[PDB]
Design a protein around this ligand. Structure first.
Ligand code: A1AH6
Lengths: 214, 214
């Protein structure tokens, strides 16, 4: 997205959370046209802030919006269970275009936080002899169930061939997901290493694997 | 107040489908500020139409929007699997109001069945060093999105320590899931092999991995 939002935020009932929406001087910074939207997954979204700070009728004053330079911010005070949702920002542009942020998943903690176990697997013997070199990054035992994954070929980001599953709650009531990177045998063998970067609750873990002689 | 959309619509591959969005004279019928969004479950939405009929760059011209009186309509020609999603309409009204429809689930009927690709990964060296031996059975590219998984230690059923993620649709419009088996290094080294057996629509794919010899 052209506007940048943090992937996730969280707080316990009664706490406050602030989420940011960063653009450039030609969008967020160029006018007072920032809006915020709330969506409970699967249901219609709702406009909750317009013109940076204005609440539509029925939106409680626990929601407030502000802007400083090229960054707008939404604050939710006294978190309530109904505030657990996805939040998006938008801003008009210079060419009367419209820019959206990528969305922030806001969790009202329903259980203790849990950092993910991250395990990165290199290509298996069987798939290599089948001319495939898929890497798997296993992410388990985390809460809230929101994670963002990035891959790097050596030091360069790689977006092609990346797939990540939607987190699902497992039998221990914590979430699991897997990110897999479909490489050719040539790609795998011709790089010094590949890395899986897992971000959860604003904290990042990195794992790396490299080809071996056996 | 919400705008009125049918809860569901459908069509076959290559066919067309039209879905409607009915508002009032002071929103949909009041100006040319009608928008349409496409959203796959668990993902951020994508604006596909603005100002009744305009497509953002990169949106296929198979999507077309029109408006008559109080009712806007989206038409998707040449339906593709990727078009199976929720579709929302929106319209600005007076008083800086932004109205949203309740959403239409568009189903693309009779999508092709696809058996899963299964790749079984043995424990990585890093985790065997940290006294862990998780195995991951990666299951991808299958449709419809339901599988069952069974594990074997040698030829015997594994009855504990298994987790399987809820399948999720990926960028190829087919489903992916992971099943992971938590073992200790001692369990991994004692047995001759471990096997993952994936059942999809009555057919079973089995993979086997054994302690390496490197
Ligand atoms: C990922 C991001 C995104 C996030 C949120 C979201 O809706 C949130 C709403 C509340 C919503 C709707 C439906 C369900 C839930 C939430 C849409 C998008 C989008 O599409 N995204 C991808 C980046 O592309 C853009 O920013 N394009 C915006 C665009 C492009 C070109 C022209 C115009 C234009 C001109 N003039 C008026 N409009 C606009």
């Amino acid at each position: 997205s052209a506007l940048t939002q943090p992937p996730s935020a969280s707080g316990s009932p009664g706490q406050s959370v602030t989420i940011s929406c960063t653009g450039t001087s030609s969008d967020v910074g160029g006018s007072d046209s920032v809006s915020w939207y709330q969506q409970h997954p699967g249901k219609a979204p709702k406009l909750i802030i317009y013109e940076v700070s204005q609440r539509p009728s029925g939106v409680p004053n626990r929601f407030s919006g502000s802007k400083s330079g090229n960054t707008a911010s939404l604050t939710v005070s006294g978190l309530q269970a109904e505030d657990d949702a996805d939040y998006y920002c938008s801003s008009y542009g210079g060419d009367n275009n419209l820019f959206f942020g990528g969305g922030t998943k806001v969790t009202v903690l329903g259980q203790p936080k849990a950092a993910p176990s991250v395990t990165l697997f290199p290509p298996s013997s069987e798939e290599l002899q089948a001319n495939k070199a898929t890497l798997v990054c296993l992410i388990s035992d985390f809460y809230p169930g929101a994670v963002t994954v990035a891959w790097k070929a050596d030091s360069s980001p790689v977006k092609a061939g990346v797939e990540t599953t939607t987190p699902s709650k497992q039998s221990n009531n914590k979430y699991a997901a897997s990110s897999y990177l479909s490489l050719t045998p040539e790609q795998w063998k011709s790089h010094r290493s590949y890395s899986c970067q897992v971000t959860h609750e604003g904290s990042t873990v990195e794992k790396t694997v490299a080809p071996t002689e056996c």
